């Protein structure tokens, strides 16, 4: 049609990439994926309750943790129900329904509606106990009152979706390679390596002879492998590399239509700088003008009881108990394979088992599927996210093996899907094909829930903007999502994109006019305000949802309170007025806009933090972390949440001690002068003990504990929290100032410091109870998040940190000793933090 052209246009602007582009394609897998994802979408749209979809209730089935019942010490909950100007407080029990509460509301003054959190696009509806609403738990946790307004339900009509309308050995001919520029130092030789991969597992390998590295190198040679065409497993990759390692590129030997690849190919390769998710991409380099390319020719098609002994059983069991990052011996794999039917009764063995399958053998793969048809135990096992995620990493390229993983993710409630959403999305980079069970699962959960949807939107867009390796695949999935999110969602996303797009341009100009010079003169500031003026016109929409806090609406830009931060790069400090008239405080929305930072890395670390908090919750612990909002918008650019009433530990030191000169009492002096009442000061000290322990443990496990004072912040309310995760020593930061606040100094003791040590321990061994989940999240984060990671050393850290193997007593001890090293170090490391990072 005609209106379809314009619609595809808006989507292109929403996605940040034109999915109809074919300038970098060698087949039609993307188009095929755009077609195949139409069904999954339509089915979910037609299946979703238009009333619950519009009001996105945010609930959870988990029990209220012990630390929250402590608040409700009267089996009564207080909810302030506003109206227009007159508010009315109603007492309610933990198991009531917002409807019941609604009715029990007109019973107080009898002389259609729904409860909405004041100043927030959050509703309290549906057949659910009020104790199970996230906002209620949020208020209960932060000792805040529950204020809700009585208004009309959103008109679901606004969510309207727009109507749519051989048994021979395999071989490859390496014709040659060619690259535009060449003039480099040495004149070394060069050769092309060809590997048939599958799950990071190199099945077969061939190489060409070396040759003078010229602008164009030809071989016109057939590389025949010792593997039959019939034996190539679906998902298998033809991995091509150039050594003289400089360039790589991959090609699926089997396409999306179960067909063998064939014909002439000219693939533009990816380079390498000074093992990682990009290494596995089937996409080719879009830069044809300066990129290396390789020519090949594919010329070669359908795709078709004994009880285990006592001693061996003990062996298999040791293997199974082993940590995920522990390598399997040839004998381990034969044991696991030959006794596969026994292995099948141990869900925690699956990864090991499937990584013991000889995928380069048709008969073995064939038996594996027969094995998988004996699911029973797996289908009934209690869902284990750690286990599930492992079957979705780089080590498994089989569609069916991965499918069962997804099958388990299907049980997760919205609340959990949100906890792992970013890692689930990142795992799509491990899928051999564009359209996969994981992609459909994500597409469906997002379409099914506005909150999940909102984030799915930003998370996919984050990759599409900065990842040439996967933006094509991710763009197609984001499109498929936008086409069924609903017109209202589409409107909100448009509002947000326009604002960030406008702020990105503003930050660029401003950033330019000031190198590595910490100044921020009235000149740059003026020119900063000047631009916001223009935007304050018919550009910056009336409002927009805060990307990291979908419930909040940002209004006009309070240009007055806006400025530029001193920081090394050029942060943009903006403040907005809440767009909702029913908001509680006149409080402004603070958001920082930065450029020149690996914001995706911070996103990863913040989600892991939110995950450790949930783990501790399952064990009645509230380490008080503070994983502030952070969304990566483009390459090194994105926005950050500004916590209210917080400064760096450094700036507090700078306040008294002076410029670069470190005192032990400064911190405590600061908290006491910021606390309105002794009661609050004591509560602030208590919050400090908790937040300090949570970050010491959390940061140690993630190996980002050795930090400079300027990257650690604290609220006037006593909440300590690290920031700037974007990539002698110490395990974590526990300096004399932190200790003094706890009432200790110089290897002494105190009621608070002792509390701190026990909490740490209790917390530390709570993360160990989930050693596998953490190892797997840490392992995936590195491959898909940071630049390059060691296929050993790097990942291996988390294992030593999680003291794998030791018992709780040795672990408790191990951690306490780490607490002592910090005690020994005092101000050493901090003072040293001027030099640089290494080791």
CA distance 221 to 641: 57
Q: Which residues pair with 266 in a beta bridge?
A: 295
Give Cα 163 to chain centroid, integer Å: 33
Contact 592, 569 (CB under 8 A): no
Sign, CA torsion 472/476/481/487: positive
Contact 441, 246 (CB under 8 A): no
Structure determination technique employed? X-ray
Which is nearest to 545 in space by CA: 474, 450, 415?
450
Query: Which residues have CB under 8 Å from 837's CB, separation 6+?
Result: 706
Fold held by 1-164: Ubiquitin-like (UB roll) (3.10.20)
Fold held by 301-486: 1.25.40
SS3 641: strand
Q: Phi and psi dihedrals of 546, rounded to 5?
A: -70, 110
CA distance 625 to 613: 7
Neighbour count for residue 774 (Cβ, 10 Å):
23
Question: Domains of the chain: which residue ranges?
Answer: 1-164, 166-300, 301-486, 487-644, 645-831
CA distance 522 to 535: 20
Q: Does residue 785 have a known ligand-binding role?
A: no
Q: Does residue 99 have a known ligand-binding role?
A: no
Compute CA distances 389 → 432, 601, 635, 775, whole Å.
16, 19, 27, 11
Domain 166-300 bears CATH identifier 2.60.40.150: yes
Question: Mind giving me the DSSP string for 72-100?
Answer: -TTS-EEEEEE-SS--EEEEE-TT--HHH
Which value in Å is the resolution of this experimental model? 2.4
Alpha-carbon Rg of the chain, whole angstroms? 29
CATH number of 645-831: 1.10.1070.11
Tokens linked to 428: 């799509």
Q: Does residue 63 have a known ligand-binding role?
A: no
Q: How many CA atoms lie within 13 A of 227 on its CB side?
A: 23
**Residue ranges in 664-718 assigned as alpha helix (H):** 666-674, 678-702
Q: Does residue 454 have a known ligand-binding role?
A: no
Q: How many CA atoms lie within 13 A of 242 on its CB side?
A: 27
DSSP state of 133: B
Residue 634, phi-psi category: left (phi > 0), alpha (psi -120 to 50), beta (remainder): beta
Q: Does residue 511 have a known ligand-binding role?
A: no
**Residue ranges in 373-470 assigned as alpha helix (H):** 377-380, 385-390, 399-409, 414-426, 437-448, 450-466
Q: Does residue 725 have a known ligand-binding role?
A: yes
Question: Mind giving me the DSSP string for 575-595?
Answer: EEEES-TT-SS--EEEEEEE-
Tokens linked to 691: 């937040």
Q: Does residue 443 have a known ligand-binding role?
A: no
Which is nearest to 504 in space by CA: 615, 634, 591?
634
Q: Does residue 343 have a known ligand-binding role?
A: no
Q: Does residue 721 have a known ligand-binding role?
A: yes
Q: Which residues pair with 93 in a beta bridge?
A: none
CA distance 421 to 425: 6
Compute CA distances 532 → 11, 696, 697, whole Å.
27, 40, 42
Question: Mind giving me the DSSP string for 450-510?
Answer: HHHHHHHHHHHHHHHHH-TTTHHHHHHHHHHHHTTS-HHHHHHHHHHHHHHHHHHHHHHHH
CA distance 394 to 615: 25
Q: Does residue 509 have a known ligand-binding role?
A: no
Q: Note whether 301-486 and 487-644 share their fold.
A: no
Tokens linked to 711: 């990257």
Q: Does residue 775 have a known ligand-binding role?
A: no
Q: Does residue 191 have a known ligand-binding role?
A: no
Contact 566, 520 (CB under 8 A): yes
Residue with tokens 């597409």: 443
SS3 218: strand
Which is nearest to 166 in space by CA: 58, 54, 254?
254
Tokens linked to 290: 């300066």
CA distance 737 to 664: 4
Q: Does residue 595 have a known ligand-binding role?
A: yes
Which is nearest to 452 in space by CA: 58, 6, 4?
58
Q: b or e along 591-630 (b: 16 or more beta carbons within 10 Å of the residue's beta carbon)? A: bbbbbbbbbbbbbbbbbbbebbbebbbeeebbbbbbbbbb
Name the pairing type of β-strands 146-151 and 77-82.
parallel
Q: Does residue 592 have a known ligand-binding role?
A: yes
Contact 713, 643 (CB under 8 A): yes
Which is nearest to 698 in space by CA: 780, 624, 588, 807?
624
CA distance 128 to 98: 8
Give Cα 442 to chain centroid, integer Å: 14
Q: Does residue 726 have a known ligand-binding role?
A: yes
- Residue 264: in which H helix or E strand, if any? strand 263-268
Name the pairing type of β-strands 638-641 and 646-648.
unpaired
* Preceding-residue numbers of gaps in the chain (C–N over 2.5 Å): 111, 165, 244, 274, 300, 304, 661, 727
- Residue 741: in which H helix or E strand, if any? helix 736-741
The C-alpha angle with vertex 633 and arms to 630 and 638, in degrees rounded to 5, equals 50
Q: Phi and psi dihedrals of 423, rounded to 5?
A: -65, -35
Q: Does residue 631 have a known ligand-binding role?
A: yes
Fold held by 487-644: 3.30.1010
Q: Phi and psi dihedrals of 250, rounded to 5?
A: -125, 150
DSSP state of 718: S
Contact 733, 698 (CB under 8 A): no
Q: Phi and psi dihedrals of 340, rounded to 5?
A: -50, -35
Q: Does residue 493 have a known ligand-binding role?
A: no
Tokens linked to 377: 């135990």
Q: Which residues pair with 114 in a beta bridge?
A: 151
């Amino acid at each position: 049609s005609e209106e379809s052209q314009a619609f595809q246009r808006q989507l292109t602007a929403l996605i940040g990439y034109d999915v109809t582009d074919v300038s970098n394609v060698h087949d039609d897998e993307l188009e095929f994926t755009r077609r195949g994802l139409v069904t999954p979408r339509m089915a979910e749209v037609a299946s979703r309750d238009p009333k619950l979809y519009a009001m996105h209730p945010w609930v959870t089935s988990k029990p209220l943790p012990e630390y929250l019942w402590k608040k409700i010490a009267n089996n009564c909950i207080f909810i302030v129900i506003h109206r227009s100007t007159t508010s009315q407080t109603i007492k309610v029990s933990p198991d009531d329904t917002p409807g019941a509460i609604l009715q029990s509301f007109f019973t107080k003054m009898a002389k259609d509606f729904v409860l909405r959190v004041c100043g927030r696009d959050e509703y309290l509806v549906g057949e659910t106990p009020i104790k199970n609403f996230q906002w209620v738990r949020h208020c209960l946790k932060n000792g805040e009152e529950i204020h809700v307004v009585l208004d009309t339900p959103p008109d679901p009509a606004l969510d309207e979706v727009r109507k749519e309308e051989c048994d021979r050995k395999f071989r490859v001919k390496i014709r040659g390679i060619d690259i535009p520029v060449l003039p480099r130092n040495t004149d070394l030789t060069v050769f092309v390596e060809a590997n048939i991969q599958h799950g990071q597992q190199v099945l077969c390998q061939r190489r060409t002879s070396p040759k003078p590295f010229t602008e164009e190198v030809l071989w016109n040679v057939w590389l025949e492998f010792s593997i039959k065409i019939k034996d190539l497993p679906k998902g298998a990759l033809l991995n091509l590399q150039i050594y003289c390692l400089l360039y790589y590129v991959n090609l699926l030997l089997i396409d999306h239509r179960f067909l063998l690849r064939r014909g002439e190919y000219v693939l533009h390769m990816w380079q390498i700088s000074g093992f990682n998710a990009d290494k596995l991409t089937s996409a080719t380099n879009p830069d044809k003008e300066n990129s290396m390319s390789i020519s090949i020719l594919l010329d070669n098609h359908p795709i078709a009881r004994a009880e285990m002994p006592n001693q061996l059983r003990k062996q298999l069991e040791a293997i199974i108990a082993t940590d995920p990052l522990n390598p399997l011996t040839a004998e381990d794999k034969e044991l696991l394979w030959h006794f596969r039917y026994e292995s099948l009764k141990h869900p925690k063995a699956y990864p090991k088992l499937f990584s013991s399958v000889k995928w380069g053998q048709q008969e073995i793969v064939a038996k594996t599927y027969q094995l998988l048809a004996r699911r029973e135990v797996w289908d009934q096992s209690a869902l284990d996210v750690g286990l599930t995620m492992q079957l979705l990493d780089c080590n498994f390229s089989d569609e069916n093996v991965r499918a069962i993983a997804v099958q388990k993710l299907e049980s997760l409630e919205d609340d959990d899907v949100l906890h792992y959403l970013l890692q689930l999305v990142q795992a799509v980079k491990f899928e051999p094909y564009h359209d996969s069970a994981l992609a459909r699962f994500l597409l469906k959960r997002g379409l099914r829930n506005k909150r999940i949807g909102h984030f799915l939107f930003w998370f996919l867009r984050s990759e599409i903007a900065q990842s040439r390796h996967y933006q094509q695949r991710f763009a197609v999935i984001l499109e498929a999502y936008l086409r069924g999110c609903g017109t209202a969602m589409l409107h909100d996303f448009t509002q947000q994109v326009q604002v960030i797009e406008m702020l990105q341009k503003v930050t660029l100009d401003i950033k330019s006019l000031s190198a590595e010079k910490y100044d921020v003169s009235s000149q740059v500031i003026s020119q900063l305000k000047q631009k916001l003026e223009n935007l304050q016109n018919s550009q910056l929409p009336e409002s927009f949802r805060v990307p990291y806090d979908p419930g909040l609406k940002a209004g006009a830009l309070a240009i007055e309170k806006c400025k530029v931060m001193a920081s090394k790069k050029k942060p943009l400090w903006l403040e907005f007025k809440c767009a909702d008239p029913t908001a509680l405080s006149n409080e402004t929305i603070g958001i920082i806009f930065k450029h020149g930072d690996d914001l995706r890395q911070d996103m990863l670390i913040l989600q892991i933090l939110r995950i450790m908090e949930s783990i501790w919750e399952t064990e009645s612990l509230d380490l008080c972390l503070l994983p502030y909002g952070c969304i990566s918008t483009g390459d090194k650019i994105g926005m950050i949440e500004i916590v209210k009433d917080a400064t760096t530990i450094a700036k507090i030191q700078q306040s008294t001690v002076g410029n670069t000169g470190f005192k032990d009492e400064v911190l405590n002096h600061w908290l006491k002068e910021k606390s309105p009442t002794e009661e609050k000061f004591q509560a602030a000290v208590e919050r400090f003990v908790y937040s300090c322990a949570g970050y010491c443990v959390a940061t140690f496990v993630l190996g980002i504990g050795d930090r400079h004072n300027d990257n650690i912040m604290i609220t006037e309310t006593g909440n300590l929290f690290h920031i700037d995760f974007g990539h002698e020593r110490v395990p974590f930061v526990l300096t004399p100032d932190f200790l003094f606040v706890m009432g200790t100094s110089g290897k002494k003791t105190s009621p608070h410091f002792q509390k701190f040590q026990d909490i740490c321990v209790k917390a530390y061994l709570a993360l160990r109870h989930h050693t596998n989940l953490l190892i797997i999240l840490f392992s995936m984060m590195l491959m898909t998040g940071m630049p390059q990671l060691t296929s050993k050393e790097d990942i291996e850290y988390i294992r030593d940190a999680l003291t794998v193997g030791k018992n709780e007593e040795d672990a408790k001890k191990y951690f306490l000793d780490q607490i002592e090293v910090c005690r020994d170090k005092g101000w050493t490391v901090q003072f040293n933090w001027f030099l640089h990072l290494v080791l």
